[PDB]
Design a protein around this ligand. Structure first.
Ligand SMILES: [Cl-]
Ligand SMILES: [Co+2]
Length: 168
């Protein structure tokens, strides 16, 4: 019983889509530093790639995550996920995302300048093929699915990372 890399999901205080949080003893045990990329394994064999931060109100065996990640992981509060470091992870050459058209009227107009540039610029966000993420944009949030990454199947969107969006 007991394992150090299996943890119980818990609601996050940080709503940033790329962030998960652990106690400091936990990070120190798993030998992780703030900014480190982790692979999370959830239910229905869904996997996510996150940035891990230290939270001091976090129980040594809890993991706080926003629901964008929980949803990507197909888990809910109190479920159990597996966490591993992701050292080999690389800066992305290209990424292909498609925006989710949920509404009549679709969405306009330049998704790149309005959503993607502002969302990705800054953060060196880690992403995976098949992630669904939500950008709080002008007028309305928009969701995108990650169609693919080069390199596949996951990577860090860097400032020189090419980002193609369907209609663009
Ligand atoms: Cl592409
Ligand atoms: Co293309």
């Amino acid at each position: 019983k007991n394992r150090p890399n299996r943890l119980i999901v818990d609601e996050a205080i940080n709503e940033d889509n790329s962030v998960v949080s652990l106690s400091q003893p936990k990070m120190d045990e798993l030998q992780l530093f703030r900014g480190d990329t982790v692979l999370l394994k959830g239910k229905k064999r869904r996997e996510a790639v996150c940035i891990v931060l230290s939270d001091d109100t976090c129980s040594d065996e809890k993991i706080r995550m926003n629901r964008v990640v929980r949803n990507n992981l197909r888990v809910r509060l109190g479920d159990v996920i597996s966490i591993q470091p992701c050292p080999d992870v690389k800066y992305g050459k290209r990424i292909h995302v498609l925006p989710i058209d949920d509404t009549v009227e679709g969405i306009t107009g330049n998704l790149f300048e309005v959503y993607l540039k502002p969302y990705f610029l800054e953060a060196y966000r880690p992403i995976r093929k098949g992630d669904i993420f939500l950008v709080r944009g002008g007028m309305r949030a928009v969701e995108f699915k990650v169609v693919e990454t080069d390199p596949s199947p996951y990577c860090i969107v860097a400032p020189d990372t090419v980002i193609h969006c369907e209609g663009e």
